[PDB]
From a paper:
The first structure obtained was that of yeast β'1-304His6 in the presence of the CTFKKTN motif derived from yeast Wbp1 (Supplemental Experimental Procedures). This structure, solved at 1.8 Å resolution by SIRAS, showed that the WD-repeat domains pack one on top of the other in the lattice. The C-terminal His6 tag from one molecule reaches to the top surface of its neighbor, specifically occupying a charged surface patch. This structure suggested a potential binding site for short basic linear motifs, particularly highlighting the importance of a terminal carboxylate group and backbone carbonyl binding. The CTFKKTN peptide included in crystal trials was not visible in the density but was required for crystallization, likely forming weak interactions that facilitated crystal packing. Based on indirect evidence from structures, we predicted a D98A D117A mutant would abolish interaction with the -5 lysine. This prediction was based on the position of a histidine residue equivalent to the -5 lysine in the β'1-304His6 structure and of the symmetry copy K261 in the β'1-304 structure, both of which occupy the D98/D117 patch. In addition to the carboxylate group binding to the basic patch formed of R15/K17/R59, two carbonyl groups from the -2 and -3 positions in the motif backbone must fit into a groove formed by R59 and R101; the carbonyl group at the -4 position also likely contacts R101, as observed in the β'1-304His6 structure.
Numbering used by the authors: 1 to 310
Write the structure that this text describes.
């Protein structure tokens, strides 16, 4: 590959806590500490739609493109769903009795997971009236991040300030396993490597480290050091051999996913970094990050997302 980073679109706003790419429209969703959410076309740089959802922080937001929805979770305990074409608020319910940190959407089935400061993950089913179909209990501190395994989304991972990642199966009440990270300040984020050649997950911590894990053996594969403040997230790029992380040190870091050495450090000048998204199909190798003072959409270069794409 050849890293060739271009700034596609950056704009200033209140602190961006959640961020996501639409899979077929050139849109990015940002969810703000102010309770506002913005939908931007980053190619034309024109706001498609925006909503003052609540007065509390909105920490989580995802597209559900197959329903033309966004789904968001906020510190006022509520999950809300809006149709992004009409602005219709579809549903609005109390989901947890404490802050909602993270929302994940199943790739094919009508399932949403929410992770919360109430120590739980909850599974909601939108084809069943958004009923609470399962609550996953076992964590001992705030659940900061939930992520389905894209290679087997009957399973998902929860990253928790109790220093563990728990991996669960839908329909079963205890973890398939609990991975102890040695990241003593807790886990802020968890992501799966999406390709079938490595059974890998990655965790980010306030302890300044990022760790790569074999989820079949539970062994630490590598520890990535160099962020100088809390690491907010770390993710595998879906098609490029890299890892991308962001930190309260104000930087994004791009790491070689084979050597585990840092390749690039970028401070985009928006202060602390909080959240990350990568384009679902690697379109123009777009990534986006949200920060204290706004967001940025970057293109990482021209390497193809599909073998023999040209």
């Amino acid at each position: 590959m050849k890293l060739d980073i271009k700034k596609t679109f950056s704009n200033r706003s209140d602190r961006v806590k959640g961020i996501d790419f639409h899979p077929t429209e050139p849109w990015v969703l940002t969810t703000l500490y102010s309770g506002r959410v913005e939908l931007w076309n980053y190619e034309t740089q024109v706001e498609v739609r925006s909503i003052q959802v609540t007065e509390t922080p909105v920490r989580a937001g995802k597209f559900i493109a197959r329903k033309n929805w966004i789904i968001v979770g906020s510190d006022d305990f509520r999950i809300r769903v809006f149709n992004y074409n009409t602005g219709e608020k579809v549903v609005d319910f109390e989901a947890h009795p404490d802050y909602i940190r993270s929302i994940a959407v199943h790739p094919t089935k009508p399932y949403v997971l929410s992770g919360s400061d109430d120590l739980t993950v909850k599974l909601w089913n939108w084809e069943n009236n958004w009923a609470l179909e399962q609550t996953f209990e076992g964590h001992e501190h705030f659940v900061m991040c939930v992520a389905f395994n894209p290679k087997d989304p009957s399973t998902f991972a929860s990253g928790c300030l109790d220093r563990t990642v728990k991996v669960w199966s839908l329909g079963q009440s205890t973890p398939n396993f609990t991975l102890t990270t040695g990241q003593e300040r807790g886990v802020n984020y968890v992501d799966y490597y999406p390709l079938p050649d490595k059974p890998y997950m990655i965790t980010a911590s306030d302890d300044l480290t990022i760790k790569i894990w074999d989820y079949q053996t539970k062994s630490c594969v590598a520890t990535l050091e160099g962020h100088m403040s809390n690491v907010s997230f770390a993710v595998f790029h879906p098609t490029l051999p890299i890892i991308i992380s962001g930190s309260e040190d104000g930087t994004l870091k791009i790491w070689n996913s084979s050597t585990y050495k840092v390749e690039k450090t970028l401070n985009v000048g928006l202060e602390r970094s909080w959240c990350i998204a990568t384009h679902p199909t690697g379109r123009k190798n777009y990534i986006a990050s949200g920060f204290d003072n706004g967001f940025t959409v970057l293109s990482l270069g021209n390497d193809e997302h599909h073998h023999h794409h040209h």
